[PDB]
Amino acid sequence: QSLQDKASVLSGVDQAEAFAIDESNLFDKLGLQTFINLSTNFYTRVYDDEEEWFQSIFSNSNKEDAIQNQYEFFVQRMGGPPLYSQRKGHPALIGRHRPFPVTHQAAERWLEHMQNALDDSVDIDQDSKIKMMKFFRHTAFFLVAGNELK
Amino acid sequence: QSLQDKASVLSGVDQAEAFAIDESNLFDKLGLQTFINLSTNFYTRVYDDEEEWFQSIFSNSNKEDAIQNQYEFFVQRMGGPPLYSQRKGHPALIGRHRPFPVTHQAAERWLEHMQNALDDSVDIDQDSKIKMMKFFRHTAFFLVAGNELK
Ligand code: HEM
Ligand code: HEM
Ligand SMILES: [Cl-]
Ligand SMILES: [O-]
Ligand SMILES: [O-]
């Protein structure tokens, strides 16, 4: 059974829905600043999280560096310039999450913070929010599936 | 030490040179058919390889499916439509190579076949060949670095 199928079964979202982001250019629609704002909001919530089991996953990471890694990845993957690879090479999401305990429960907590970040946004329309959360949700469970094999 | 830095040290190519592919659109320059031809040539060489230690790495894989996975990934990453993700989701190269013994020596053998495939091409110019092999070489050693941690 493939990683992507495991993600689809766990998450309620398959790759086809998760990658509906690719049907139009979201970077062109939303703009770079919108991504920076989303990631900054998300990571503010992460680093303020009172649940130590989740907070402490990010303890070896600087918040500002994490914000940059995230929005540069989102920008690159959602139709914008490839800033992430210029700096860091392949996204390699399963490989890069290897050090962290990416459990089913951690996925839901990540996605809670991100939903709250999307709810706080001004410059993201409803169609875009739906497509982005399908992408995020499928991806989070893809990482869960990758975590299970390491 | 990061995966990308380990790749750079091993390979003689850093991420900056490896991702010079992103400076212009190679898909626009070369066209889809050129990619299909390259991957078909490459994989013909792989599956005809008399060295069992290398050949047998690909024994659980169908040749035609492998050709499709490769060129769809190259097309997606080198400026073309995102065919790979439509079908399979994230490239996740480290995760997807987890089942295979991706050693330093296997990297060099892979890159031997690919060089021979590039040498056989008609529709790839010298500037493009240089950029593609920098990308491939850095990537192969990135996978070596990922292999070392699994
Ligand atoms: C499933 C629960 C998740 C957990 C617990 C988690 C945890 C982490 C942690 C601790 C980092 C290191 C922070 C940094 O230094 O940048 C990280 C990095 C990253 N995460 Fe996640 N993550 C999760 C899901 C996701 C999802 C759903 C995506 C994309 C949609 C994603 C994309 C990334 C990216 C692009 C990086 C930067 C990698 C790097 O450059 O080092 N993660 N994650
Ligand atoms: C380092 C030595 C390498 C070895 C021994 C190796 C081996 C393999 C094998 C056995 C597969 C499965 C064939 C399939 O079912 O598609 C595979 C898949 C793949 N490889 Fe490699 N590989 C290497 C390097 C690379 C490099 C340098 C790249 C990209 C530049 C790459 C990209 C891929 C892609 C995109 C797939 C398809 C993954 C999938 O969809 O399952 N590989 N590789
Ligand atoms: Cl990966
Ligand atoms: O993350
Ligand atoms: O490969």
From Swiss-Prot, chains A, B:
Q: List, alphabetically, the CDD domains matched.
A: TrHb2_AtGlb3-like_O
A GO term (biological process) for this protein? response to auxin
Tissue-wise, where is it found?
Expressed ubiquitously, with higher levels in root tissue than in shoot tissue.
Q: Describe the disruption phenotype.
A: Slight reduction of the number of shoots produced by root explants in vitro; root explants are first cultured on an initial auxin-rich callus induction medium (CIM) followed by a transfer onto a cytokinin-containing shoot induction medium (SIM).
Give UniProt keywords alphabetically: Heme, Iron, Metal-binding, Oxygen transport, Transport
Which residues of this UniProt protein bind heme? 84, 97
Highest taxon listed in the record's lineage: Eukaryota
Q: Which GO terms describe its molecular function?
A: heme binding; metal ion binding; oxygen binding; oxygen carrier activity
What the record notes about the co-factor is: Binds 1 heme group per subunit.
Query: Required cofactors, per record?
Result: heme
What this chain does, per the entry, is described as: Hemoglobin-like protein that exhibits an unusual concentration-independent binding of O(2) and CO. May promote shoot organogenesis from root explants in vitro. Inhibits RGLG3 and RGLG4 ubiquitination activity.
| Recorded family membership | Belongs to the truncated hemoglobin family. Group II subfamily.
Q: How does it assemble?
A: Homodimer when ferric. Interacts with RGLG3 and RGLG4.
Know the name of this protein? Two-on-two hemoglobin-3
Which species is this record about? Answer: Arabidopsis thaliana
Tell me the gene name: GLB3
